[model samples]
Target chain A: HMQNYLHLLQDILDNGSDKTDRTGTGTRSLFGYQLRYDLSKGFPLVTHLKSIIYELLWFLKGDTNIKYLKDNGVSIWDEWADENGDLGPVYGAQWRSWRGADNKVVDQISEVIDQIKKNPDSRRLIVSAWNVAEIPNMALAPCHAMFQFYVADGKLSLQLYQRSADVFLGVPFNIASYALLLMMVAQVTGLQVGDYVHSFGDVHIYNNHFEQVNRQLSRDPKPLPVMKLNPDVKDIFDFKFEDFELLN
Target chain B: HMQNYLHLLQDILDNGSDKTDRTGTGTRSLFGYQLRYDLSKGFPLVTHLKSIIYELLWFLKGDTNIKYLKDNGVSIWDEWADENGDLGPVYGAQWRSWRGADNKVVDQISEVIDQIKKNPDSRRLIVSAWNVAEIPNMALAPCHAMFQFYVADGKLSLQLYQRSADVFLGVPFNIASYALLLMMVAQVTGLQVGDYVHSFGDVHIYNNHFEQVNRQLSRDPKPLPVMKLNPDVKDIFDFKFEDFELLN
Candidate 1:
């Protein structure tokens, strides 16, 4: 409920200075931060935003083709979709069937799960979204290129490292999505969700969203709530929309 | 002098199905291909659109702010830059100074150079543009997240594994830039430039750029010329725009 991370983010937005990156590009002012959650406490979500459950379901379905989302009454991808309901391999497809050399298919999520179970300590247990071969085929590449999973002390944790994050509108969603994933995987794998670590690369606040950031910061912090998963579903991929319930 | 890669790209464009990617966001039909180069012959930059020399110089300067680019008559980042010459940490910065935990700086290009010189056999010799911590600060995160360097038989090769690529306008540039980088690094590191292996994740053709892809593919392939870097400068960081000379 403290919303400590939000407050930290607010400070960065209000006071950060512009600096030159090594690419000899001009100076850029930035705010970059991270939040860690213990899934054992609960599913992490901002109570302020409604319908996160549906959003999580949307991603899991791996339906970047916007029509499916529209059929389900979600319209976020509508603006980006082509007439045929395609958004390229933005997220869902990248998570599932990333193309590799010799026409090999790289299922990132399944691979990560297997690696976590088999080589828990291997730092190389990375699920990458930046597939070079498929880049020409995708509408938009994954902003959050890859994530790594770690297991320690009988608990499961995930560290999502995004290459680009729209701090105002996207970060919160990114956090919730990966955290929920941690919870889901924990449930299926029989491991406690230890931590959901959000790591970022180029996390920036768009100029148009400056006001939203300020307004959100002005609000008083509330208690972080717990996420309750439908206990019946034993497989990570078997989660239905009704399986998630948030509790304070 | 045959551009086989271009022909290959053209073939994919012409014959590839209009299948929707898993995201179902947009559809892309592929076409003709080309791959023209003699690795032993020279740097490849043969195309209708010329003058990437200044752009390459701008990127190597690690300047993401874009004002420098505009000053030097390059407007690629003009659409993304803010009033204060900031576009956040995008490609240039990510390649030059990738931020890490505890504010540790990871200069990917320098690291790759070091690895090529000292540990060419290390599979981990990679330059990553996907910096998790700095994502929040990027205007646009990297599409080509990272690349690895491999050396065998006295030839230095670069394998770029891109997360997302816009096939029409970006892929050509992406390939040329990286191949040039490979050559520059090879020259500086005392190795022969071998092959530029481009690996992709979500390679998609944006609906808006399909025409350009078609136009480019329709043209007859030309022999990609060799790019000669000034021998006077040994440091990768010190090479200037005038240092490069293209020869057919």
Candidate 2:
């Protein structure tokens, strides 16, 4: 599974185009790419706690307010938060209560779970954070913008489409976050784990990170670490950070 | 490039999982696959005249009202449109006038063009049709639900993420429509065409379509065809069916 991450770097290094990006850091970028991970092969395939794990918890807590992160000793969102500690309607808000033209709240994550239980054959098991209305108000629009779930052979598979990615820094975090989320969703929905498909729109390695990219590519990957969640918890919202454990 | 399409079919035939779909037709489905078409190598790599060309025109006109399609003698959408000849705010409406929670309308296609023209380096050059609030209201939700464009080295590339693909019946036409659309966008934005990357979520061949798929896969692929646009047409909305010609 780690090989997937390394291979993506290799592909970008070999075949990417020279592009100037919005962040003012020039990139060797590619238009489209996909990476796949099978969860049963290993536990949370990338990174440990202190970074990606808390990020996932923060997103799932449905808190667009940055106060929670501050209270929890995380300053990752300090730059983006407003005076009110709000990021308008970002990923957390969009994932939980996506507001509509009628001001009706659509709980996308809940709906997907319900649909999986009710009609597993549905092709429309999608959760999207690319709210065109909310983009203007947000600090930043979502990068892992949309995801869909598929159920087959008593297993659940998730495919995420990220509109933008920083291959050296952001991609591994994206992979771990979605993979962890997929595990939780599969556990609760009474389905076995299937593949996690990571698809990207603009996948790029920043010019500054090329040396690090090649450095990471030079080594063989270790065995995937095991991700263990509290077996008794079935509801997605009920699980706390303490209920999770990772095995090296 | 035609080989890419055929190989996808071949890959699906070999590796797809048997799953039941919402249509009650069984499918040999696979999650997360991508195909790349470099437009600089050829014109349009797929079909011509009478079929895919007009469908592309119909969608760009943003007319969900099936009368225009009927007038053009393309009955492809007749099966989905209601008696009033409407598909409730599918891709056409979503692309042109996406309704938001704040009672605002966002014209996504216009926005993308403006973004490309005004700031070609922006990574957020995205167009999405997956409105969470409106999915239940639509006659059929969009399959080619989201797309993003990237500008690199004075060329524009597009990545399309389709949620559900009926492999044998729909894919080739879908490829043509979007490739054609990419060329139009690139032309309007004063950029050369780069790649048209087709990525899918639940890409599947229906059980009914297996033989047809196998038959098509068995044939030798001919040379890629040329898709010509009237050089005089500048605005994206200005191109008509008569302005397009295909050469084999």
Candidate 3:
């Protein structure tokens, strides 16, 4: 997988530089890539990580406080905590209660699931997390902030476009998280997880995370794993973290 | 600016739940936010936080190895590195040397600038950082993955749709960084800087950043600052960090 991307990267570096300059940063420097998944083969998260059940449950809980995270043993956000255990609405709030114009609440996940089942071809089947009104209340702004759903050949595909990524720790989780979401959505919508397309903007390796990247790269590539979602759940919102079972 | 966003959040929390499910989980929730900028007014860096001039420069140089970052006292990527500092072309390489199929090189920054000047109205004008092939090699995948450019009436606008956001610390920088990009693009394309429309996907407040969000909310918004670009530099690629002059 990486060798193919390396070739793609090399191609862009060699040829695409002179394509055009629209963003005005001088050189046409940004590059984009995508991955396709066939859920019939199994969930895409089987590769690098395992057991994201708790995290999914945490997202569903919509508790922006770290109590649940600590309980689940996920301390990624601990460094940013204050005296109180509030880290602001980084993920749960956006997933659950997003503010809309005229002060209306918009639940993106549920809406997208419905859209996939109801109007599979609607171009407006987009879930957005960028709320102008809530900017000040957030501990952080969304980077992989929005995603769109596409259905083709009776299969459900989700493409997540993230604005920033921490490559090593974050990217793996991102892949697993979204792939899991795709599987959950597929189960609820009665479709198969066709592909998981990850798109990015300003994707950078923070100067801090270089070592971890190399370490992971050095490790031998493992066979992709299989992700099993509770087959009984039909409603997207009804899914519990325990519903996921990872097969190594 | 933040005060406006806070009031907006309050109003959403108060009224916006009927049309949608604002919170997915019944407990607490996370939310994401975005702000647009007309780079014609000024550069978007926060005077409050330390300037990221050196950091931005480091990225532009396409030096992904991180030696320069260490030398410059930036440790943001320190956590993800291996001994060699080969962070796997996360940003710098993606920006300057993106690999493509058939060994093609795609320099997005330069390409976008040229596209704006040459085909101002082309909808295909896009910059993407999500490299699928390079994912394995990357320390992290991109978060703000893709951005599109549109030109109307001699004014240029950029709409960035992000998938996730670290609302407090990163949103400000994201806003400022893109706004600065817009201004730079406008200058290079002989267009005027217009609005920056930020769209998000899963805008969440991490369980840890709540206090900081609240503290920032408490602070009164000062006047929006203006960023002045060095008039003499006609080429976007020629911009130096010193060319930016921030004024209130």
Candidate 4:
């Protein structure tokens, strides 16, 4: 079971194409790939670099200002934030108040949750973090650009479309973030969680991260850790860092 | 080589999950899947559907009105059009004139061509048709929602994220349409075509189309046909219907 996680780590090493990336790092990359984690089985925090919960709370709060993150002591975004701690119109802004030319706001996160509850069968349950107009103004463009939700048989499934992925450094973090988000929505919408499908445009391992990648892959995976959300929390935004607990 | 295509057709037949879709038709579905067509091998018009090219031209022209298609004797979108022959703000409108709240418009198709020529290595060469604000105004939601272009070694590749795929009736057309677009962009950008990576979210086979799908699968696939584009057409919008020819 954990071999599937190891398979991707080795698969990229064996088959990824070599390319020069935006960060000027060389990468062994493949064009398109998909990965799945069935949340019904367990929380997908199989990777042990455990800052994922903090990042999920970070994005959920819709705080692009790094002050909250700095206060919380999360430094994953430290390299990308500017002097003022503003990261421009990033994921949080896009999810909550995506501004149009007239400056009207569309709250995609709330709307998507509403649809999941009201019209569970809709094919239109999509929330995009890619704001074309604001891309030039951002520090870094969105990697996990858009995601769609699907529902059937009282279960909610989510799929994310990420344009570029750093397989070693970013993918594990990204997977846990979205899987946690799926469970949060499922909890609010009163549906069982189905699957979190992670789709990539350029999934790659950086030439520099090869050593770390192999060392991590060299070990076999343990059982998935349990992520327990407070069952009483019915609103998406109401949950705090204390509400999520990791269990053995 | 076409066996890659055959494998997917069979995989879904054997393993697709059963679900009810937005169209009220029951389907055997799967959440995430991908396909790769090497455009350099030959044109990817493997489906034998002759009108595929006409539909691509129709969208490139950005004509939401059906008059052009009616004149061309193409009625594929007929069922979706309203009484006045409008399909609302579908793909062409979003691609060419995607209006913001401030009334500014982005011509994504033209802009992407410029990016492919100027900064070929950029990972953000994306064009998305999933307009959250405009969904209610459209006849049918865009199933082929967003796509990104990638370049390496003087070759261009494209990836599409389709939210819903009607595998039997819609996927063949979708594959050829994007592949043709890839080749068209490559010709104008002075680069060799690389690959068309198709990623699907809810890829499914409708119960009604199962008979047709099975019959279509029983035969061996023919060699891919050649799609010749007129060398004189450099601008994305300047290609005429006569400029393209399919050779056996």
Candidate 5:
């Protein structure tokens, strides 16, 4: 699984085109790349446990304010936080409390999970964070915009359509986050975990990150580490941070 | 380019897992896959011209009613149309006039084209047809749900995230449709055509179509044909069915 990340880094370095971005930072970018991970092998973590767990829990709880993440010692979202500790209607808001026309709210996370359990053969098993109406109100637009779930042979798989990927810094985290989400969804739906497919739109590496990427690419990848979630947690939201254990 | 589609057919036949579906037609399905076509080489068509042009024009105009199609002798949408020829809030509706809260409407096609013309470097050029709020009202949920445009090196590329694909029938049409869409957008934006990336979630071959797929795979793929669009159509919506011509 780590080889997938390493190859991505190499591919961008080799084939990416140089382009200017909104931040004045230059990017070596390529459009439309995909990576696949089989969750039955092991957890696909390039390396964070604490922050990844906390941030996912925050999103799962339909949180937009940075307060919950801040309290949990996760500062990844601080750059986008406003004076009110809010990041507007970000991932969490769209996932668990997406508001539709007429101010009607739809809990996408809950709804998708329900569909997964009851009608696993459904092709419409999707959750989207690219609420076109709510984008203007969001501090930062969603990069991992939409995702779909598929089940076959008593196994659950997930595919995330990420519009933009900061390949060096963010792709690994996105991979781990969604991989964990897939595991959780699979467990709750009483199915075995399958593939975590990450489809990207503009996958790029920042100009300043060249040295870091090269350094990492020079190193050999070790075998993947396994993740164990508490078996007693039957509901999607029941698992706490303490319930997750990583084993080498 | 046709080899890409043929390889996908072989893949599903060899590796696909059998599963039951909504239509009671069993399928051999795979979770995620992607195919890339370079428009700079030739127009990617697994072949259609008349209906493709008319259908694409209808979508570009954002017309969900089947009257225009019916007048043009296109019956592709007849199965889904009501007596009055309305397929409520399908692709055209969301593409051209996506509705928001408070009944505000967004012309996504116009907005995205404008963004591409003005800010080609920006990664936010996306047009999504999956309006979660409007799904229940739609005759059929979107299969090619969302797409994002990327411009680098004076070329425009498109990546479409299709939630479900009927590989034997729909995938070919989808490829030609989006490839034509890319050419149209690129022409209007004054950029060269780049890549057309087709990403999938549940890409499958209906169990009944196995013989057809095998038949196609047994034949050798020919060279891709070229497509010509009238160069004077400076606006995305100005092109008509008469303006497109195919060359051997």
Candidate 6:
């Protein structure tokens, strides 16, 4: 299944058009793409699980500040944080406290989970980080802008709409993070896991990452690893770091 | 071209799972599907061009009230509108007057057009009707919730993230509407037309429309017709009904 990730890299290298981008780094970009991973298969982990797990937990905790991440030795957000360790209303803020026109805060994560348990068949089970109103306040605009949850055949599925993706590096991390989120949600809802659909608007391999991508692609995929969660954890918010176990 | 729409219906019939929906109309539904159409081939029209054309114009005009649609002989909004012919702050209102966190209104249409012209490489060329704050004010939540524009190789491409789709009745109309929108944007940006990527969340054939879907799918696709625009009109908003011509 990891070949799916390699195939994406190869697809962009072969078919993507060369274009100059915002960061002054050029990219070979494709307009639209979709990748699906069936979650009943093993976990899609290719990065340091330490950062992935802690970063997700931080987001779920709704802490946009880098304090928790830094304390956990995850410095991925270090460059983006302010002196006070704030990243403003980024993912965690939008996910937990999305403010409405009436100035009421919507706990999107909680609401979506409730909807999943009560009304699993709903098409409106969506959580968005692309709060147009809040974008200017965010230190960085959401790349994984929005996602929707779907339920059928007693399985919970998720589809993420990432407006922009640095295909070589950020994408693998994104795939793993969302896949883990899906697993957690499925566990909380007492349903089996389904597919994780990662859809993109402008997916690209940065010019600087071409060597890294080609070298990575040159290697063959290995046997998949499994990630287990504490079956005792029922609430989405109740899971802790110690509850997770990985088996090679 | 039209076969894509038909094939979608067939795919749902073959693979979609049965589920009860909000409207008390059960559906055979599939999650996460994508369809692409190249504009150079021809227009993907399967509906009454009158409603499709005028309704899109109405959205571009940012007129949420049904008065404009009613005056143009498009009764599509009539059912959704109140006795006063008002539909609250729906698609048009959100598109043209998206309010920011600081209470300033954003002209998303104008801004996106400007970005496409000035910074064509921007990944943030997106217009969203799924305003977290504004959804409550809408008469009906936006099904064609958000869309992003991409430019590569001097051609403009569009991808729409539609949260829910009524496959048998609504999908074809959406295809034409967005396709036409893409063409108009391309014209104003001095770029050639590229692909239209329509990505869906819960795409389903409402059980009530099963027979209609089956009857339509049993028939073969016909040659796609062409839609021509007045090349003289360079501005996106400068387009009029008379500017369009369809060649069968």
| Maximum-TM-score candidate | 5
Model 2, which residues run further than 4 Å from truth? Answer: A20-24, A44-48, B21-24, B48-51
- The local lDDT score (0 to 100) that residue A205 gets in candidate 4 is 85
Ranking by lDDT: 5, 6, 2, 4, 1, 3
lDDT of 2 at B176: 81
- Which candidate tops lDDT? 5
Note the DockQ of each predicted structure. Answer: 0.02, 0.82, 0.02, 0.54, 0.77, 0.70
Lowest summed lDDT window (length 10), candidate 1 chain A: A24-33
Note the Cα lDDT for every prediction shown.
0.63, 0.84, 0.60, 0.82, 0.90, 0.88
lDDT tens per residue, model 2, B1-248: 57877888888899988876456767898888899888988864555455667776776777678888889888888889989998888888888888887678988999999999998877889999998888777888889888999988899999899999987878878888898899989888889999999999888887788888888887877778777778888898888888877777
Predicted complex 6: DockQ: 0.70
- The interface root-mean-square deviations, each candidate in sequence, come to 20.1, 1.1, 18.8, 2.0, 1.0, 1.3
lDDT of 5 by residue, B163-199 (tens): 9899999888888898899999999999999999999
Candidate 4 CAPRI-style tier: medium
* Angstrom error at residue A3, model 1: 4.0
lDDT of 6 by residue, B1-248 (tens): 67777788899999999987566778899999898999989998854888888988898899999999888888998988888998888889888988655566888999999999999988889999888767777788889889999998899999999999988888888898999999999998899999999999999888888888889988867888999999998988888888888898
- How big a share of the true inter-chain contacts is recovered in candidate 5? 0.67
| Models ranked on DockQ | 2, 5, 6, 4, 3, 1
TM-score of each: 0.50, 0.96, 0.50, 0.92, 0.98, 0.96
Worst 10 residues of 4 chain A by lDDT: A46-55
Show where candidate 3 strays beyond 4 Å: A1-248, B2-34, B41-51
Q: Which has the higher lDDT value, candidate number 4 or candidate number 6?
A: 6
Q: Candidate 5: which stretches are off by over 4 Å?
A: A22-24
> How much lDDT does candidate 6 score?
0.88
Better of 4 and 5 by TM-score: 5
Order of quality (TM-score): 5, 6, 2, 4, 1, 3
Model 3 Cα interface RMS deviation (Å): 18.8
